[PDB]
Design a protein around this nucleic acid. Structure first.
Lengths: 144, 129, 150, 81
RNA sequence: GAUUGACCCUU
RNA sequence: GCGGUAAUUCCAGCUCCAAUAGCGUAUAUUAAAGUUGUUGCAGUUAAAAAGCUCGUAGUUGAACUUUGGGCCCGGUUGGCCGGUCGGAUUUCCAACGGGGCCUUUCCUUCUGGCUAACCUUGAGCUUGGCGAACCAGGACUUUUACUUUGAAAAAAUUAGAGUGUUCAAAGCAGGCGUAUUGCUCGAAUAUAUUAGCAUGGAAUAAUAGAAUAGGACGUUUGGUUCUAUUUUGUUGGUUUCUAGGACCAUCGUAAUGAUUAAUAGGGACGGUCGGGGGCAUCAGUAUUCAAUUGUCAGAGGUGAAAUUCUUGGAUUUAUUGAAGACUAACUACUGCGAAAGCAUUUGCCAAGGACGUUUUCAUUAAUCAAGAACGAAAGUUAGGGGAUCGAAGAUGAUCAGAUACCGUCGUAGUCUUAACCAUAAACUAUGCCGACUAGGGAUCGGGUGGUGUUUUUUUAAUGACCCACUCGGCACCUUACGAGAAAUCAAAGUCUUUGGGUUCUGGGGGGAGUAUGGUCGCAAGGCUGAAACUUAAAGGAAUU
RNA sequence: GGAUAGUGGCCUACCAUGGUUUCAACGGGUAACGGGGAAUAAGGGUUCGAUUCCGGAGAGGGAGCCUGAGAAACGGCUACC
């Protein structure tokens, strides 16, 4: 009988079984528990502003050896600390001190992208001016 | 236990057909079985069949030919409307030119095309093609 | 088969096709009826009445010889048992197993079989209550059963 | 086989089959009129007795029950019925 | 039937 | 994945490939996702069949009751008919739910009004027999589910007879005069689950009838309750079948009156069968240890070895005795049990399958949330027991180290009695019930049969074997009918030709069987049981 | 019986454990106003619907009321944080 009940009055059994077995899905469980609004760093939001705090002695994944910086950021709405990855060459000019940086996800819905372990976010704006605008030299960060 | 006598009959017919046998024995010969076999007979899918009368429930010996591809039963007997007949036919028939979805209606057991010609509907039983 | 076992045994009487049988029997339907009631008064269940009618005398079955079956005859003639024979025998077997267990606590097999037999008793008694051959709220109790059997 | 007449099978095969596996199942048992030597005392007894069947005349039991068929007494004349 | 434990670099 | 002094991937010279006034990003959501699977997943080995049974709710549940025969219609063809230079339908004999007749097969009382399918010829659209196709009152679609026909998702959509906002998205506009007149089509069509309404239908599933007759009609039959419609002088009142009904006697009618007995299930009986279970209790050697004379210096152990016992006699050999455990060889692709498990005799106690049955019941059934019974070993609490073996530990050795493997001891334990525990690779890693599909050498419990062998009498008879062979089991043996990723599987088949019933479980790997909250437990722990976070594999068959 | 504009445990005196519930009551959560309704299929549809239309609610939160046909009205009054 292929497992599942087939009776014409077994609709309640089928619905309840489906309700119970929906929970095995990763995204359905997150949606119905509100894990975005309780424990996601961004509070279920696409982007998040933050204040870059300090340097931490972290090491990149395979293959490299690069310990210069990866921005620790304190969010404004949550106050939580997240590590973000400055997404272009010449990261030095934009991490001066206590800057306000806008952060987006890395694109994997909450997972690390590549050779960067434990980093789920990237920087798109530095004090209201776009990071790739500074990278392409087409706009200037406020120096006065 | 024995739940669907029509399903057991249709499964026996299918197994004998696939094995190639020219005849099949069926127990225990319900009236729904008789009507289903009469529909197959009218559309030329089996041939002849005999009702052996033991006093308990009856048996049926069906002479098969090479024509039957698959006879099946739809359990449960889903309530089918005029809107749903096209749904079921496009779900479980090889094409729109042959094969019949059989359903018990208020005017007895018939196939879907005769049900449309009589403008009636009912509960789906099975299918032949 | 065997609701309380894994046995798949097919073993039953092959009832003949002939409902008016067997043409070598030249005794009367009333005579068979009177033998039935004399046996019921003697204190036999319909199973034993039928086995004796079929064996000691030539009686294929009371259904085909007279107008009905043995339980129907007894109910019509007032010899109806208070509880049906199968339920009585199930209760008797359960009472026997319970008396055995009382002396043999360590008999876990007997405990299991007592659970099986009492489940059968409750199912059959529920059927009898539904068909109303038993009074409503009729219930099988272990203490009352010993007196109910004997 | 591929083609065969189930409607009219051979009596040999039907007798070979189980009593419940025939077209119309029928009992493979039978009855017999038994007469003890001396007094005729014609009584009809079932083949599978399950009972020490005897007439009410005297101690002249005619069969002994067994697993299947009843083994009739040594001095007894049976007639198939 | 003994003692043979280990061996940092990419498809 | 690229980059490690020869980068088609980084930063630049690059045809600027692709979309384009747009394009790239991030989060959520949708299809792909048959990776939520009613349609339509998977569970032997990839995640997944609860250890095993019982059982309530739920889901599901054998067959049977009116089935078949004859005339008339709005309404399906190429149409000798070409009558209208493809709407033109008579012999139209190729078919129909529904309105009527015969086939034992009728469209609800009893009283009326138009006066109910009409017994009623007025020299050629009728004064009285019978009702439901409107209305009156008591009555029934005993009850559904189901299934075509109308307010039903009040408003824009679905495509539009049509419509130039620059075409188009869009709104509903718009179009034409003998142009001094003026006229006008049109803005409707699908109801967005379920529900309540009215209507036709009877297939598909019935507790309901009538059975220990307080069952159905009786114009024929004598007896108690509210209106009085017949009046004599008036809204209160009496009486002879009452109009709307409750017990009476079959003078008084109808074939008064119970479907099979499912290779469904329960129960009874019969002869059996089994290492199924529980008790009193029997026996067997062995192990260990003890009671004696004899014996000689080694002996038990290991791959050479050494804690060890030993001329106060060790091991080896007496005749024995005691204890506790176990039940060898028989012993098997053999049996029984729901599993765990169960192998010495006798008895007792209850139980069970299979088979046989021309017994009985009659659908009592299948699977099963909650809820329960049993549940190896180890472990726990006490009391017994304590031979052997032996987690711990003691100890000799090999070893770089060896608190391991190997050697000798050795508490707990191993054995029982009450009470817990409730786990296992509790495995066939394969849920249960039902059906159906190449064929066989065999085997266990029965075992239709074959004037086939032995002690007795080779010349009746109660053995056992040998051969046809049914039935129910444990299993086996060669392509594939088929299945599968394969290994392999007569089931893991009858699954994209996808639905027999039903329970449980799984949804990438880890974190983690963790945390937390319950709950059971003396405890150990058992059952239920996550998230954060991390991750691109981890896995399944061995192809070279 | 009272109060209502009106039925009604909406409240008052006496009389029961009556009513709901595994066909899931009660409790908890909702980053839940509900419906008409975007995105797909002749049937898999899964989400979303604060938001142009309809029905609700509120006018910082609770409470109370006058006038008025109509208000517990807050661009009307009477009382804290």
């Amino acid at each position: 009988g292929k497992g599942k009940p087939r009776g014409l009055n077994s609709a309640r059994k089928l619905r309840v079984h489906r309700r119970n077995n929906r929970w095995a899905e990763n995204n359905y469980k997150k949606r119905l528990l509100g894990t975005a609004f309780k424990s996601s760093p961004f509070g279920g939001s696409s982007h998040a502003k933050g204040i870059v705090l300090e340097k931490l002695g972290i090491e990149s994944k395979q293959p490299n050896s690069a310990i210069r910086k990866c921005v620790r950021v304190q969010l404004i709405k949550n106050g939580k600390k997240v590590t973000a990855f400055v997404p272009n060459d010449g990261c030095l000019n934009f991490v001066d001190e206590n800057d306000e940086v806008l952060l987006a996800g890395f694109g994997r819905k909450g997972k690390a992208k590549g050779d960067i372990p434990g980093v789920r976010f990237k920087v798109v704006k530095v004090s209201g001016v776009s990071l790739l605008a500074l990278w392409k030299e087409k706009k200037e960060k406020p120096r006065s | 236990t024995r739940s669907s006598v029509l399903a057991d009959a249709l499964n026996a017919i299918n197994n004998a057909e696939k094995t190639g046998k020219r005849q099949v024995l069926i127990r225990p010969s319900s009236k729904v079985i008789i009507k289903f076999l009469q529909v197959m007979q009218k559309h030329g899918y089996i041939g002849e069949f005999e009702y052996i009368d033991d006093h308990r429930s009856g048996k049926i010996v069906v002479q098969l030919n090479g024509r039957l591809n698959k006879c099946g039963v739809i359990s449960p007997r889903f309530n089918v409307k005029i809107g749903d007949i096209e749904k079921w036919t496009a779900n479980l028939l090889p094409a729109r030119q042959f094969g019949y979805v059989i359903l018990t209606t208020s005017a007895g057991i018939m196939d879907h095309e005769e049900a449309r010609r009589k403008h009636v509907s009912g509960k789906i039983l099975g299918f032949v093609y | 088969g065997r609701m309380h076992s894994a046995g798949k045994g097919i073993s039953s009487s092959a009832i003949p096709y002939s409902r008016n049988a067997p043409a070598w029997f030249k005794l009367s339907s009333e005579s068979v009826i009177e033998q039935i009631v004399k046996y019921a008064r003697k204190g036999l269940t319909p199973s034993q009445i039928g086995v004796l009618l079929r064996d000691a005398h030539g009686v294929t079955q009371a259904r085909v010889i007279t107008g009905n079956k043995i339980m129907r005859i007894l109910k019509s003639n007032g010899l109806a048992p208070e509880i049906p024979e199968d339920l009585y025998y199930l209760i008797k077997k359960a009472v026997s197993v319970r008396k055995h267990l009382e002396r043999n606590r360590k008999d876990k097999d007997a405990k299991f079989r007592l659970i099986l037999i009492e489940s059968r008793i409750h199912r059959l008694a529920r059927y009898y209550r539904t068909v109303a051959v038993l009074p409503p709220n009729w219930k099988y109790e272990s203490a009352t059963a010993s007196a109910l059997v004997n | 086989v591929l083609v065969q007449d189930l409607l009219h099978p051979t009596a040999a095969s039907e007798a070979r089959k189980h009593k419940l596996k025939t077209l119309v199942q029928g009992p493979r048992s039978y009855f017999l009129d038994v007469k003890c030597p001396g007094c005729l005392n014609i009584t009809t007894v079932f083949s599978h007795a399950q009972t020490a069947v005897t007439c009410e005349s005297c101690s002249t039991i005619l069969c002994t029950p067994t697993g299947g068929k009843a083994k009739l007494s040594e001095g007894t004349s049976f007639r198939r019925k």
